[PDB]
Amino acid sequence: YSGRDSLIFLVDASKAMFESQSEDELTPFDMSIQCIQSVYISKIISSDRDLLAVVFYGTEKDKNSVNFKNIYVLQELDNPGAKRILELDQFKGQQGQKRFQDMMGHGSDYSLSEVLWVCANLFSDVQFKMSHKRIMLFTNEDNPHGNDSAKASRARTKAGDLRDTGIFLDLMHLKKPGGFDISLFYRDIISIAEDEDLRVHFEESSKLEDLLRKVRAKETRKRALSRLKLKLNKDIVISVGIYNLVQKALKPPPIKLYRETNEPVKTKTRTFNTSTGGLLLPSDTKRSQIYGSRQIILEKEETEELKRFDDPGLMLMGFKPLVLLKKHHYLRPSLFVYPEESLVIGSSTLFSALLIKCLEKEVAALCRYTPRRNIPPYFVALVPQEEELDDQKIQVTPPGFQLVFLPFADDKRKMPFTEKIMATPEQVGKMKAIVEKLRFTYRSDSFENPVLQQHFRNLEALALDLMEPEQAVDLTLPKVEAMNKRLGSLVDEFKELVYPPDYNPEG
């Protein structure tokens, strides 16, 4: 998967789309606008390098390269930004609907062939490589052309041509007074006709709920940190790739701006002599360190050369039982090692054999690891990792090796000596009861970083000039009320059984 994903939001501008079934309900047009805005915000937060477009059909005015009738391309394929969101915001309400009607109009005819032609033309203009081509149809008219059959045939032919080109088509059908029926006309235009998507739907599509669900977490495409060589010995070498399945998420780096006109500035660092005033490059100056009441002077090149031990890669040392590995010896986040057949042919077979035998014998490969040049070596353990799938066969644990760093003698710290006091069985039983009362299931994606979420919310509020920032609920805060209700009296019994009458833990 290489390139960018392009999406086009086709929104019908027919009269039937501007009628609300109930007074306290959202019109289909407003729902489509809200979905587009949500997708825009999600793309800005997650993938800012993607391309989006917004096109309307069935209007009175037109704006397109080919100069068709009743097709107004509101926004062409361009990276998302706050300006487009603000522009779309002027159609959200009823006054926005009036503004949209005045600007473009509604109630005119249209031909789906022209719409698809305009979409294809928009796709062709983009110069960047596009991994995905996608179009979404926000409409509530299952029979766009019932009076004319030639128009339907032309639309079918254009949809087929687009499908052959490699353009995905999706139908976000909206509520209809009568009921949407895909079988009428949209069975062929839509790229994939699901078996369940054949009955008459009396409610908006379920995909709108997914679209409205804002995702405020960055998405990174698969990439290899390094492509190194595993050396069983001097003459047996295979090629492996290293990946970081877990990586800390950081706020985007701040940028320095000028106060007067918000124009970015450039920061430069320089070093000058005090007694002469001249400028010194980072080669005239030396390095120093005061040991034993004396000064030791080393050049920069020598200082860098102090760290040269061995060439980059992994060197095999032996195999160790997994029992000897310790959980509390954590030093650094682990990495993932996978075969890489491009550099060396035959690496995959040996890697698979090693993984199978390591799983069978429950052993881990001890290795010496050197990520880059002029970096001191470390001792790592490659633990086999089998392929684990979930109920729906979606892979949850890939096959390969888990690279875990092992601490040196300097990475451990001595602990103060503390006398051991053992609790009586009754206290342990009461604590067991409390623990059982406070039991819950844990998942790796059950928590979110409050700082990053609040930062994203504040940034969006500032960019869109919203009245107040949206407040993010913190799921990491203990539920004091629920815990108190569940525990009941157990806390009092434990405190009576473990603490003297006058202890005052807080004090």
Binding site: D170, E219, D445
Partner: peptide, 23 residues
Amino acid sequence: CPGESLINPGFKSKKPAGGVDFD
């Protein structure tokens, strides 16, 4: 390929974080 993220093709959709839910 059920569960694929509509917003981001090629990435598996992630369920909303539920925090702690006692049994």
